[PDB]
Design a protein around this ligand. Structure first.
Ligand SMILES: O=P(O)(O)O[C@H]1[C@H](OP(=O)(O)O)[C@@H](OP(=O)(O)O)[C@H](OP(=O)(O)O)[C@@H](OP(=O)(O)O)[C@H]1OP(=O)(O)O
Length: 359
């Protein structure tokens, strides 16, 4: 079956039906919002129902619109053109007072990303919202048109980032250190399997420690760090751990060790959901970590609202240094991108409420 999502206006005059809650962005193109509006003909006689798509960034206090489009759904515009199969089947299944609408995304918009601060975080809440709003318009006096709220339905859809057709090079990084009073160096080489991983896919961090010093590498710790840059209004910055694995081995003096740890960055593994960039509201079940921001060529990054990136951090705890030979500890970073899997190149309908489930 195909679950159709609906939402009824307060006066029950305009009901909206979408085929999805989350619409797919896979770099090359963005999935369009096709849907239908069921109109109570007696409550709308003399009115005009439109449907609009608005993407906007919010901080707080401050707001900046990023994209706006609007389409007339009633009265029917031109030829009754059922553009998509979903629209035609929803009209055949749903009645005669059903009229279709199509709203298309551009390529210069971000994906659904929003964050609510933590106790120690200085910044305020912010996010990027995509709102599908259907509404009716009538005219009592000849001097103005009015838009009542009760004749409107408001939906908050997602623009979800899915993997593109191609992928980047293999992520690698090398680092070296010669501590004070030591002629022999400590070397660290980190490699990932691929450049793009999916939400829930295991990330195998391959660590190669070549220790030529007199000192023992007490600990090897691998982290998945999320870097979040707010690029509108205030230049807030967050760097938080979303996955951690501590290696069981030590590296004795004048020896090498190559081990592959496995980390899985998931929002489900963070009891604290504040201070990190998410793709939805915190209280919602289907909320995940924000996917890696993909800035397209030529588009100024400020329009993206919130920039989200991911990196592996390998931290080495070395003996004989803490407190007498160094004041900073050794680590290195390996960037990668995180997003959702790649898209795959007379229907039966069951209708549910649009409201996302809680937890
Ligand atoms: O302030 P309102 O006009 O009453 O809007 C609310 C509010 O949405 P916003 O805060 O984004 O404006 C709810 O969110 P909460 O503040 O309660 O967390 C939301 O409920 P959801 O959390 O499920 O989004 C609800 O929408 P809905 O009725 O679908 O649950 C929506 O009400 P409206 O339908 O009037 O927009």
């Amino acid at each position: 079956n195909h679950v159709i999502f609906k939402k009824i206006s307060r006066d029950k005059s305009v009901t909206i039906y979408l085929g999805k809650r989350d619409y797919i962005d896979h770099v090359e193109r963005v999935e369009p919002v096709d849907g239908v509006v069921l109109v109570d003909p007696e409550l709308v006689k003399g009115k005009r129902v439109y449907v609009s798509l608005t993407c906007a960034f919010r901080y707080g206090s401050f707001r900046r619109d990023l994209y706006f489009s609007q389409v007339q759904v009633f009265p029917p515009v031109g030829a009754s053109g059922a553009t998509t199969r979903l629209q035609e089947s929803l009209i055949k299944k749903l009645g005669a007072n059903t009229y279709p609408f199509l709203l298309t995304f551009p390529d210069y918009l971000p994906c659904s990303v929003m964050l609510q601060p933590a106790p120690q975080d200085v910044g305020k809440s912010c996010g990027v919202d995509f709102e599908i709003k259907a509404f009716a318009t009538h005219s009592t006096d000849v001097e103005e048109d009015k838009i009542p709220k009760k004749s409107s339905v408001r939906l908050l859809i997602r623009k979800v980032q899915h993997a593109p057709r191609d992928m980047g090079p293999q992520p690698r990084a090398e680092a070296s250190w010669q501590f004070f009073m030591s002629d022999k160096p400590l070397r660290l080489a980190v490699s990932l399997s691929k450049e793009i991983y999916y939400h829930g896919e295991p990330i195998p961090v391959t660590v190669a420690v070549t220790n030529s010093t007199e000192k023992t590498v007490k600990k090897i710790k691998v982290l998945v760090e999320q870097v979040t840059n707010v690029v509108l209004y205030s230049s807030d910055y967050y760097i938080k751990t979303v996955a951690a694995e501590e290696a069981q081995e030590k590296v004795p003096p004048n020896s090498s060790l190559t081990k592959t740890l496995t980390l899985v960055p998931l929002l489900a593994n963070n009891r604290e959901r504040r201070g990190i960039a998410l793709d939805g509201k915190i209280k919602h079940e289907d909320t995940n970590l924000a996917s890696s921001t993909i800035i397209k060529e030529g588009i100024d990054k400020t329009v993206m609202g919130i920039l989200v990136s991911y990196q592996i951090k390998v931290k080495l705890t070395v003996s004989g240094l803490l407190g007498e030979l160094t004041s900073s500890e050794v680590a290195t970073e390996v960037p990668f991108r995180l997003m959702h899997p790649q898209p795959e190149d007379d229907e039966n309908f069951v209708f549910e409420e649009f409201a996302r489930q809680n937890l």
